[PDB]
Amino acid sequence: MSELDQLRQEAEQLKNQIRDARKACADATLSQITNNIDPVGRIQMRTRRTLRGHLAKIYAMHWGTDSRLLLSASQDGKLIIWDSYTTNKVHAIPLRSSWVMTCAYAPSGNYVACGGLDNICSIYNLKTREGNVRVSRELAGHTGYLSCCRFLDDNQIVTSSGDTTCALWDIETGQQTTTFTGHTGDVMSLSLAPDTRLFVSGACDASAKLWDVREGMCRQTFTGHESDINAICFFPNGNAFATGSDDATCRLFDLRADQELMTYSHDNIICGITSVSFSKSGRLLLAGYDDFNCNVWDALKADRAGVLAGHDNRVSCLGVTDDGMAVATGSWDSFLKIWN
Amino acid sequence: MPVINIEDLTEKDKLKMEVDQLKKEVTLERMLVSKCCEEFRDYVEERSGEDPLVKGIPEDKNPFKELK
Amino acid sequence: EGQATHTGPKGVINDWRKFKLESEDEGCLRKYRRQCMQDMHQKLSFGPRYGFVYELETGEQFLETIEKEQKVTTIVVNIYEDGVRGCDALNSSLECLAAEYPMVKFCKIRASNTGAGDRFSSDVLPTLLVYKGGELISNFISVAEQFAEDFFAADVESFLNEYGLLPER
Ligand SMILES: [Gd]
Ligand SMILES: [Gd]
Ligand SMILES: [Gd]
Ligand SMILES: [Gd]
Ligand SMILES: [Gd]
Ligand SMILES: [Gd]
């Protein structure tokens, strides 16, 4: 007969070894070094635009690289490409499922994707103009819901799934070029490193994994959260990233240190974090909680710098422009807002 | 030659792969958190002064100015 | 709360589930969409306890009102001083607002009565502080500057609404 119980122990002893290797470089926390840095002024953003058009809860949104066009997926089975400057609608795409979990905007603006409980990642060409009937490509493969997706370019897109996997597809052939396996739980979110050579992912096994796109395998596995990681976002310079989880805490992980540099939390905060985003300089870390509230964190000092949307329990998702000029919020009442 | 892989492996096939990855990760050379923090503080502090959401935007230089 | 169930993928999953418990327990889709949004105003719409701008006379009073208040109630406190421009207009506006948003508690107090003299110079007056759930949600120094010399309740409202500080629809 063969054996497993023992094989379950070499895993723990190895994890145990990695813990020590880490604990060996943990001489200080980030807040220590930033103790003399001046805290930021109270951050108070104001609504400049209100996007009207959806007929239901907004599930997810994503800014276009021009910091003007933005896409929004709703429970109304619609996908809307807006022009935030004028609040005008540019495209409107009927979906087959109301259960859209994510939507993405190709950096070129030529495409836009989305997917959800349909276990499929649908791609739409905005240039050939598939607004009414057409659907460029339907990426089938995952055996679990599609949690998130991010374009690498026009013929390459990465997806995360409830099937414990992440995949790199070739839009043209529509084949699952690479398959990133390793998580032991449902992958909830993913974030492309700025150079798109690497990308990180959060899952329900409480770990964040750094993957090499071009090489197709896991480089490192981060841990600290005792609960599911629901959101992950890369830091501006590519050397770190943030995570939000059900343990009501945000964590800053540095890639070179292979461990968390700081944690963001307060005793009054008891809901899970399902959304995280950095400001342009990375000084601010915006967090969306499951109670529809949003807190603005001072990435350096680890203290709340402010509240986004005055805790009106109306924030279901958010996003920051590449130019760091504005933040967008989705809501359960069907409206999106832009804040400066 | 990208790697394609279906998920109908056995628990053992996954455990194997797990210890393998874990070993690779163990051979990883790490940097002192201190050195990492200094660079984080450095990058952010010198850029936060130009961050639109940190300092605020002069009304004329705001793309989302009161529409007229 | 613990595990998420209203936002992100978790939200879609739980929305889909609660959906089924209703259709058998396109047309059923739209009904559900309306029910979720509807299901929210009601929980966010609380009883209209007030209707007037209350005057606080000491710092102890200030501290007492935000402390003992229900965590769901939004408290708008106005720190002012007579004679100082803008104050009167703001107080007028607040009286009308307090009457329209009975679920929002509106208060006013002289900078002198705060228990922090110099800290509040006419230069930053009037200052509008807004609390909720025991924590400070907004702090508007020189609020009067956010409006035209002559401003009325509807202006202060538009303003507060754009920071997401006022309830109901
Ligand atoms: Gd501001
Ligand atoms: Gd406005
Ligand atoms: Gd879990
Ligand atoms: Gd420097
Ligand atoms: Gd530097
Ligand atoms: Gd009104």
UniProtKB/Swiss-Prot annotation, chain A:
Phosphorylation at His-266 by NDKB contributes to G protein activation by increasing the high energetic phosphate transfer onto GDP. The modification N-acetylserine is found at residue 2. Pfam families: WD40_Gbeta (PF25391). One of its GO terms (biological process) is cellular response to catecholamine stimulus. WD repeats lie at residues 46-94, 95-140, 141-181, 182-223, 224-267, 268-309, 310-340. GO terms for molecular function: GTPase activity; GTPase binding; protein-containing complex binding; signaling receptor complex adaptor activity. Gene3D superfamilies: YVTN repeat-like/Quinoprotein amine dehydrogenase. GO terms for cellular component: cytoplasm; heterotrimeric G-protein complex; membrane; photoreceptor disc membrane; synapse. SMART domains: WD40. The keyword Acetylation applies. This is Guanine nucleotide-binding protein G(I)/G(S)/G(T) subunit beta-1. The lineage of its organism: Eukaryota, Metazoa, Chordata, Craniata, Vertebrata. The gene is GNB1.
UniProtKB/Swiss-Prot annotation, chain B:
It is a lipid-anchor. InterPro entries: G-protein_gamma-like_dom, GGL_sf, Gprotein-gamma. GO terms for molecular function: G-protein beta-subunit binding. It comes from the Eukaryota. One of its GO terms (cellular component) is heterotrimeric G-protein complex. The keyword Membrane applies. Pfam families: G-gamma. SMART domains: G_gamma, GGL. Retinal rod outer segment. GO terms for biological process: eye photoreceptor cell development; G protein-coupled receptor signaling pathway; phototransduction; protein localization. G proteins are composed of 3 units, alpha, beta and gamma. Guanine nucleotide-binding proteins (G proteins) are involved as a modulator or transducer in various transmembrane signaling systems. The beta and gamma chains are required for the GTPase activity, for replacement of GDP by GTP, and for G protein-effector interaction. This is Guanine nucleotide-binding protein G(T) subunit gamma-T1.
From Swiss-Prot, chain C:
It comes from the Eukaryota. InterPro entries: Phosducin (IPR001200), Phosducin-like_reg (IPR051499), Phosducin_N_dom_sf (IPR023196), Phosducin_thioredoxin-like_dom (IPR024253), Thioredoxin-like_sf (IPR036249). Residues 1-169 form the Phosducin domain. The keyword Nucleus applies. GO terms for cellular component: cytosol; nucleus; photoreceptor inner segment; photoreceptor outer segment. It is found in: Cytoplasm, Cytosol; Nucleus; Cell projection, Cilium, Photoreceptor outer segment; Photoreceptor inner segment. Residues 50-169 are annotated as: Thioredoxin fold. One of its GO terms (biological process) is regulation of G protein-coupled receptor signaling pathway. Keywords: Cell projection, Cilium, Cytoplasm, Nucleus, Phosphoprotein, Sensory transduction, Vision. Light-induced changes in cyclic nucleotide levels modulate the phosphorylation of this protein by cAMP kinase. Gene3D superfamilies: Glutaredoxin, Phosducin, domain 2. Belongs to the phosducin family. Interacts with CRX. Forms a complex with the beta and gamma subunits of the GTP-binding protein, transducin. Inhibits the transcriptional activation activity of the cone-rod homeobox CRX. May participate in the regulation of visual phototransduction or in the integration of photoreceptor metabolism. PANTHER family: PHOSDUCIN (PTHR46052:SF3), PHOSDUCIN-LIKE PROTEIN (PTHR46052). This is Phosducin. It comes from Rattus norvegicus (Rat).
